[PDB]
Amino acid sequence: NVGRAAEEMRELMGAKIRVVGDHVVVDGKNLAPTTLARVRALQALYPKTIV
Amino acid sequence: EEMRELMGAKIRVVGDHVVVDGKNLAPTTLARVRALQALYPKTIV
Numbered sequence: 001n002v003g004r005a006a007e008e009m010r011e012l013m014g015a016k017i018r019v020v021g022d023h024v025v026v027d028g029k030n031l032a033p034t035t036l037a038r039v040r041a042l043q044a045l046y047p048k049t050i051v
Numbered sequence: 052e053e054m055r056e057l058m059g060a061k062i063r064v065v066g067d068h069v070v071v072d073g074k075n076l077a078p079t080t081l082a083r084v085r086a087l088q089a090l091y092p093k094t095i096v
Binding site for chain 2: 042
């Protein structure tokens with residue numbers, strides 16, 4: 001279930017925007033390198049991830 | 052629980068996998084943290 005996977009991602013970052021769509025989708029305009037590195041650090045939690 | 056005792060600046064949460072986070076940790080602390088990486092394959096930092 002991607003619904004629970006999305007919730008886990010949301011808490012770990014709570015400037016990003018989290019939406020469910022069909023796969024996990026993360027978007028943002030001006031994010032710090034640390035935030036991007038943190039975001040792609042969570043990439044090892046679900047293969048179906050796009051940034 | 053084993054990870055928590057071995058470090059008791061870090062924050063330990065259960066989530067779904069073991070999650071470790073912190074802002075300004077010493078290199079020794081990071082080296083110690085990834086030294087515990089040989090205890091569970093499902094670890095992220």
